[PDB]
Write a protein that binds this DNA or RNA. Sequence first.
RNA 1: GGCCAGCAUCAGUUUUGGUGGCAGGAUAAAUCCAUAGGAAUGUAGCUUGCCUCGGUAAGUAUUAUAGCCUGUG
RNA 2: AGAACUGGCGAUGCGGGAUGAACCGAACGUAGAGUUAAGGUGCCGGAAUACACGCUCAUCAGACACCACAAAAGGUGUUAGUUCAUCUAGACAGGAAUGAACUA
RNA 3: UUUGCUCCACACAAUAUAGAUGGAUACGAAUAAGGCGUCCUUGUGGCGUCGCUGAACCAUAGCAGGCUAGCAACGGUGCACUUGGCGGAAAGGCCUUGGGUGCUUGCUGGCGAAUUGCAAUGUCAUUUUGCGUGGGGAUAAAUCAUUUGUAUACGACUUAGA
Lengths: 134, 197, 188, 96, 106, 171
Amino acid sequence: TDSIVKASNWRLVEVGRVVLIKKGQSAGKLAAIVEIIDQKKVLIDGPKAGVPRQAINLGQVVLTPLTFALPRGARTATVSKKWAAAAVCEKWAASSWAKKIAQRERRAALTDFERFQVMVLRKQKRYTVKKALA
Amino acid sequence: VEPVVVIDGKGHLVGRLASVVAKQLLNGQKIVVVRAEELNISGEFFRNKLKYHDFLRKATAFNKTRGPFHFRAPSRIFYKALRGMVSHKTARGKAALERLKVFEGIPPPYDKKKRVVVPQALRVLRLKPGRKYTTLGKLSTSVGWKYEDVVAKLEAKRKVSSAEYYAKKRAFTKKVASANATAAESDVAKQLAALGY
Amino acid sequence: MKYIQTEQQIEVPEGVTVSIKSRIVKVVGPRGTLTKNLKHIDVTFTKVNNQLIKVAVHNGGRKHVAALRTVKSLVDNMITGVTKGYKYKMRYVYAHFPINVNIVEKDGAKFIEVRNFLGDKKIRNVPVRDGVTIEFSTNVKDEIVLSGNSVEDVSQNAADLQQICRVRNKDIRKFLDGIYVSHKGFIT
Amino acid sequence: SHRKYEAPRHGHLGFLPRKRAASIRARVKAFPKDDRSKPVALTSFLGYKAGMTTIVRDLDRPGSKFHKREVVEAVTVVDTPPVVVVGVVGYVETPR
Amino acid sequence: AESHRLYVKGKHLSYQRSKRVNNPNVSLIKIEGVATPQDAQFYLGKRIAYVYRASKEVRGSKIRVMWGKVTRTHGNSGVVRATFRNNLPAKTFGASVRIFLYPSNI
Amino acid sequence: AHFKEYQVIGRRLPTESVPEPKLFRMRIFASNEVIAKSRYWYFLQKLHKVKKASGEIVSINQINEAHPTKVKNFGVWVRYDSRSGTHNMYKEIRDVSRVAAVETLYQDMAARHRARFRSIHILKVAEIEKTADVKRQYVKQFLTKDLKFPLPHRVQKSTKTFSYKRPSTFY
RNA sequence: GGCCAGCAUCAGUUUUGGUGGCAGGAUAAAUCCAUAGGAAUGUAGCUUGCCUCGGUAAGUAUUAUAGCCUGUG
RNA sequence: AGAACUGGCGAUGCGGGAUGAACCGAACGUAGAGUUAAGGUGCCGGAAUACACGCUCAUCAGACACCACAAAAGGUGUUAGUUCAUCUAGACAGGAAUGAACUA
RNA sequence: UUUGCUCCACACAAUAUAGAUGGAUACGAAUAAGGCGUCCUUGUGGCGUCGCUGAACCAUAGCAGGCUAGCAACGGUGCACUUGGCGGAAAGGCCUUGGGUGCUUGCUGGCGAAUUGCAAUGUCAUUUUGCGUGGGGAUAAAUCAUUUGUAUACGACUUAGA
Ligand SMILES: [Cl-]
Ligand SMILES: [Cl-]
Ligand SMILES: [Mg+2]
Ligand SMILES: [Mg+2]
Ligand SMILES: [Mg+2]
Ligand SMILES: [Mg+2]
């Protein structure tokens, strides 16, 4: 018998935390936290996505589970080398969160003819799945 | 989008929910509110109890049956807040109020239907943690509502029936998901993935 | 000023097991078990090892931080309650009329009765809360001892016995008659 | 200005309105609280008022001046023939 | 198929108005799925028809139509302004209207 | 508004008796050049016997932040008028530029002391070069090594009136 | 040719988007690049004492197996 | 109650201040379109349950000029600030800060 | 009081719409925490996984949706019946057994459409009632007047009378 205490799994505001911008000119792009200014402001910089080094409000971004090692106050060139070494882009694209964003974009790009093909394929798949149930 | 929208009043601030519902009624949407006894009001219990006493002492001096009517039920308290946000003395206002139903608990006509929530009026999303709030069911009892225990007993019976339905539905969902899982990696499945579905 | 982070430490002895989930705290010890609901503080409990537990507040003000130390004290009292217990001792004080205190059983409710307080004909009855045991100590004149695992249960039960013997319509500086707590300590 | 002298109000405001009763048979609006650990029995009975008369009895009241002494009291007699059970009715609890 | 709809559902909210004065010549229309003035620019110039029923038949039908058009946007939440050949009756506040896809710029 | 920093150089009008009058400079935080020149004469009339009718503006130039992407700890000295009396204060602000620190200062003064723009004089804005020279505890707490903190109770924004699921505040 | 409408090409007034070429400032400031100096919320390395055979703890140490700051070009 | 200068009401509707002869905006033939003033945009009610940094929890909170009231004096409630002293040479309470006097 | 009253099916008229135009798609609780899957010693347990909105899921092709042929499955769904169980808070609904029958776009075919003339809701829903059909079901009361005084200004109330 050992003590049991449930643990929280919050995403921490820290240097090296990868964030996702949801508002502004850089919406939908990834950036890394470089330094914490105050409770609501941090300095971010994403070079790969073309996000300029800027001080941004924490209400403009969403923290992501990804994190990589990064010295405090690192410059744009240093961030780029660390970002590529950690392969942040590859790890992000492998998550279900990113795939859901990619699927949502694909849904809106469909044409009327392609939507007709989706219905035909869905009915064919439905016939097989319903048969397997019975 | 639904012809009838059923709102679960649990965990909703009364004033913010009332403003949302009043606008919906005037736009031509039918609304049904259930579990009105679980509504929340910002502020501690004593403050809201004091406020109702100020409401209780207002009445016509020469005839008490002419003055303001003080309804004690949780559903009618929410109705009072809602009627104040509608021009109820007009034909347009009367027609809007006929599109609304408020109940304590979940009556049989709606216990098998889908219930939604209003995020703008949710207490957990609006009030800062640590702020005091009052439950409408407890407030109504202290001012003369008689049917708190009856509703509580009926709600317990409904939850037992609802739990059995969910257990049966959950088992069926697991079987359906497995059928879809084993139907993947086929030619049809690959084509659907390329198109987003 | 919205302090970034504050922490407190809780020490767990060898024989005590603590289970905390969703601010529901349960402690198990040799003397028994205790439980407490803490869904009114908004704190975070974390476990370091089997011997240390930390409780923290993130971005809290002056009033919120003050309650963090209170939570530590409450859990500590639970832990020492189930490993050492609490013992409150009270003494009977009177000038002329002796005070007769006995244990009675009214419809299976385990009351404690007070007789002849300032020569009153009224019968004073105090309920005994669950988990509190009452014994009249020997080799000491006019002493009653209350013991239990919960400090709040023991302290409140002793407080009820003291409040029930208050003098009315008299100068209480002169009429120093009553039952007062004389020692607070541990069973062990 | 204030009334020159204070007197209690005439009448009781809790018996309003002073209107004719809806039916000649008055309604029983409350029944004794049920005790399920007892045999089934009625809680009320029906009868017809006949009149009043006078009785004499001893008084058993320690401490009273007229203790163990005869007193004269007025009584009312109600004619109560047995009633006939002709049906049952069931009620259910509702939020209304 | 089970559906044959070729229009977008809309609601008649009210007339153009200040706090105490209304203007029956302009009606405010809410379009489902539009919650931004930028989205509402797509529907500018589209024809609007209000369809209602009557007990008396005149030109071989018991159904009558009031025709209109979207003129401009209104506010920040996707509401648009519309004008009809005959002003919509005030009893239709909260009634459904049909926004067609013609004239088409696609 | 969004403040900008200017340098304003002014002089007294040249005269036959006294040619080449001395040049005076000061740094002004203002929304635009029109306000900046107005503020220049406002402070100059508190220090020298001169006014706009007897002076001339020589040059006004915008001053940009040398390192607009570096976090700095600024020490700010201010003088302001309350409802009864005048007081001097010292405050510390952590940001990436002087204009951003000054905008925060005006918001802070209005919020905590109800001081309007007309009642505030900025005596000096300087950057605290060294750590351990910070003397306000609400700034020192952000200078700790390997600072980390979560964001509990996340509240998401909904674009629809009705939701078909109970929201969660996990983060 | 009376009533009510649709489209196209124009004129007057106005509303809302996409996009191109130039000018100015510290001839934007930054980023980036080259070079010199410096420091700590001190990286590697090294010493020291407890340490469930590697993890901290504090001294040294200014780029090394991380980096950052300032000036100049 | 009685004077000075100017603008108003009376002789004047219209938008705003819930409501009001005088305040704010603006003065008026009959219509159409566009843009604004003062004032507003949770619902009544046309228009962001917009964005940003703080402050406040009241067992009689507060909420917008004219305007439909509140004072002296106080609070280890909470926030920021001024001056002085103690503290790395271990203070205060019984291992990092602490004490006192003041300001709003 | 000249074959009336009631229920069922459609036959035609009248009446009206606070406003159908693919589907109101059912756990509870917590939010400084949970959902789902999985394993065990079944717990305030271990492990994995999900969120960051319904932008979903289901449904969705055919004269507003016709007439026919074949293939592969023995599934999917509509209608009328039928077995059983459950639901009283306003239950008037939900689930299930069996066979009959129509459709099936899961796949492959063969004919039909025009002329509403370049758009005109281009009419496909459910509210109530009435008049004619035939297949069943059921054969009363109240009031005035008279009478009573437990009632009463008058009405009303309370009693009696084949
Ligand atoms: Cl009375
Ligand atoms: Cl009579
Ligand atoms: Mg009552
Ligand atoms: Mg006159
Ligand atoms: Mg007013
Ligand atoms: Mg509005």
